[PDB]
Design a binder for this molecule. Structure first.
Ligand SMILES: CC1=C(/C=C/C(C)=C\C=C\C(C)=C\C(=O)O)C(C)(C)CCC1
Lengths: 238, 8
């Protein structure tokens, strides 16, 4: 029931917590609503849902950038690096965020405006062959009982990654990630009373296998959507 | 670029 004194890490944790909540609404503090564009059977692509989903995707990527600039030291990196980090982590954070909006008993996921889609609608909106992979991840997350604090730190840790190809100052990025890992660890300790640190980090590796496929889902969607892929989505997954 | 503007 005792913990050492860690003032500075506690401030960082708080800043990242706020940065997260403020750039990503809580499921409970959200006015969920339903649609039905094609909740009955899975189809190649429900254009009506894609239009909505793609609009929500554009906005959430915007918020992620907003979240990135709120991370201590992020803006201190070079512009090229910031862009590099964002492009490499965007999808990972997107998956993590949507899966945090999972309502297991109704098997749905809620978007930032409240739109709540079920598994079939998620598929028809554009996830296609990823639907199951993402839902499984959402389910494997429930036992961890992560809060916005942990989600923000985990997202921050995923973003600020020195092992990204093309970084001009990797060691500078590595220096920013250290406090984050330690803050996540320290935090897990006071909260969860006691082997969750490695367990939660291991989830980053699960995210990579899913984001790996998401890159190929973009190519596929390009050939099936009416116009062109929303520009911001193109910059982040090209 | 959109990223540049948003980051600038
Ligand atoms: C961008 C994008 C994709 C993934 C989006 C994900 C994984 C989450 C979106 C979450 C939102 C939009 C949340 C919110 O609003 O709360 C997929 C691979 C389907 C292909 C098309 C481009």
């Amino acid at each position: 029931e005792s913990y050492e004194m860690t003032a500075e890490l506690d401030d960082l944790t708080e800043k990242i917590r706020k940065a997260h909540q403020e750039t990503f609404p809580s499921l409970c503090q959200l006015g969920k609503y339903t649609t039905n564009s094609s909740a009955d059977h899975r189809v190649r692509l429900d254009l009506g849902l894609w239009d909505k989903f793609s609009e929500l995707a554009t906005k959430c990527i915007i918020k992620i950038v907003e979240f990135a600039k709120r991370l201590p030291g992020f803006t201190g990196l070079t512009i090229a690096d910031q862009i590099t980090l964002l492009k490499a982590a965007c999808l990972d954070i997107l998956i993590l965020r949507i899966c945090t909006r999972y309502t297991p008993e109704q098997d749905t996921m809620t978007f930032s405006d409240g739109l709540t889609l079920n598994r079939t609608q998620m598929h028809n909106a554009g996830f296609g062959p990823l639907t199951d992979l993402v839902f499984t991840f959402a389910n494997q997350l429930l036992p961890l009982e992560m809060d916005d604090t942990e989600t923000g730190l985990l997202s921050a840790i995923c973003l600020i990654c020195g092992d990204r190809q093309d970084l001009e100052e990797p060691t500078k990025v590595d220096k920013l990630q250290e406090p984050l890992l330690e803050a996540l660890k320290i935090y897990i300790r006071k909260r969860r009373p006691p082997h969750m640190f490695p367990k939660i980090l291991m989830k980053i590796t699960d995210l990579r296998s899913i984001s790996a496929k998401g890159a190929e889902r973009v190519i596929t969607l390009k050939m099936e959507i009416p116009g062109s892929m929303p520009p911001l989505i193109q910059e982040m997954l090209e | 670029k959109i990223l540049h503007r948003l980051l600038q």
